[model samples]
Target: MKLSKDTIAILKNFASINSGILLSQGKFIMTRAVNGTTYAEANISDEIDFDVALYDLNSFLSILSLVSDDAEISMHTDGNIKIADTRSTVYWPAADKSTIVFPNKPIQFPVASVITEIKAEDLQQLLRVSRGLQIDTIAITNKDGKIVINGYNKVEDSGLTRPKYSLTLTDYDGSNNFNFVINMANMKIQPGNYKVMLWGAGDKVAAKFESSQVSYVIAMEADSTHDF
Candidate 1:
């Protein structure tokens, strides 16, 4: 969904409050403690993209600061932040002006880019690109090999599948990921390494694919079988 310049501004300001830091022309990076010994760093740029109201921005930031440490992100006064978790909901307080209440509809923040680096220990768990939160496009690159997958223009509640494989990744992009709605009933049941590409809503549309998209290339036993 397209946000008006004014709305976007409100989002930007809201994003800043959460970090308790200024989104100025300089670079700001902060690291938070996550799973034992692991830390996630967030880098917010000085650029602002949203023009939302001060109150709105404050409300937005209030909720953002509560995100789980498993995610990495940076916030801008323009309501844009780089998120590593794509399936978490962003809640907020009620608005005094509009009849909107706190924790209302899901908020979609405009993103410039996002990079998620999965930990080596967590590599044992099977991963899939889930659609629920705001993510416009995703570009997964395999840091160890020529494995890259790009997924875009996601419909809400809809996700793509890829060929089964076992491997790991060094990074991911959550802020750059744009969120959209999809028809879950129409999705594929197969699972494996697949890329999703999407253009903004309108006359614009595009699609692309890469081999690095595969975060893992799990080894299958000779007698074991799988579906994708």
Candidate 2:
């Protein structure tokens, strides 16, 4: 039971979204965030067939980091995990799998009738600058037939205009002007072009990124000031 580098990479992404994980059958699963706002799931590998609970997800990932990328991770049916390489052989205990309540299915969002694509580097840059403005919200809007991405403080303490960073998207098209607001905290993604879907009357958005062997679906926060 050797895990591939792609599997480890996907596990690292899941670690950032949830505190613990339940590996059942051959899929690595994670539900919404502790606040129940975000969700993610991935199929690490199908060749492995051992159910386990990793309560300390970060620690487990850390141990995996020490092993070589091509190292083999052997799992025993008797509740033991093994990793051996030329340098070291490590053994760890697996938690009771029965304690985990896996989500029966992936998180469901409103059907997105409009799909938009955005460069990963562009979105990443927007987020990085947003953090510097001390803003936690990323708002996407269609203004005057142009798409705009802005980061602003939703809750203002003073009676003055809040500071914001805005970027006009030159490569977007849609018939209606809509607004979608997402929490910057929930945007955990790697570098790649992303496919974004907007639906639910501008109240929900989903983004997906795919590679040769791994893919991620990130549910973004939507504007909640309007009626659903």
Candidate 3:
């Protein structure tokens, strides 16, 4: 059985979200961070069918990298994965599924009080800047009747002001003044516009992005008590 390029790409994305993965039937699931704050699940081609644990997901990706997108992939009943092309064939050992702890479905939040759509590039830029400043917390709130996303360093003990970043959006509307703080450290998203849903009252938020080839639902952290 040969796996399509689309299936391989989705597998790569899921692998990046978690170091270990559980492949069963035709579905794949992965969770990131120690606390399992981030989770991702996607469907793949049914070319292979064997429940196995990948202790190092990158190793599998490396095998795929060595082959073409349309390479023939086969899984033995004994839990061995093989990838072959015109020039090379590589075999990978699958670990015992019982050794890995799989994560449950993603956490669910209440109805969103404010739903805002922002360009993926915009959020990516914000993340880039925050990463440079070593800031892990970002706030999405409504200020002066407009939606604003702000990133800043925590207060210092020396009384010195910290660097800050802010971006305003004029396309959002909401009656309630809501402030949701998200942990940027665990975020995993590609560059594309996303629909960000805020459950300000529940201190939870989710970002959804869709494209012709892939669709992702990212669960993010929200701090309800965070002040401006």
- Index of the highest-lDDT prediction: 2
Q: After aligning candidate 2 to the native by TM-score, how far in Å is the CA of 83 from where it should be?
A: 1.8
Give the Cα-based TM-score of candidate 1 against the true structure.
0.18
Tens digits of per-residue lDDT for model 3, 40-148: 5554554455566777776787677678755776775556877777887788887776665566554444455666766767877887888887776667777887888
lDDT of each: 0.30, 0.63, 0.62
- All candidates: CA RMSD in angstroms? 19.0, 3.7, 3.9
The lDDT, on a scale of 0 to 1, for candidate 3 is: 0.62
> Which one wins on TM-score?
2
From the highest TM-score down, the ranking of the candidates is 2, 3, 1
TM-score, cand. 2 vs. native: 0.77
Ranking by lDDT: 2, 3, 1
TM-score of each: 0.18, 0.77, 0.77
User: Residue 34, candidate 1: how far off, in angstroms?
Assistant: 5.0
Off by over 4 Å in 2: 27-31, 43-46, 68-70, 98-102, 108-110, 155-163, 170-172, 201-222, 225-228
lDDT of residue 158 for candidate 2: 31
The regions of model 1 sitting more than 4 angstroms off are 1-26, 47-59, 62-126, 129-165, 168-228
**Clashes per model (N, Cα, C within 3 A):** 59, 0, 2
Question: Which scores higher on lDDT, 1 or 3?
Answer: 3
lDDT at residue 166 of model 3 (Cα atoms): 84
Worst 10 residues of 3 by lDDT: 154-163
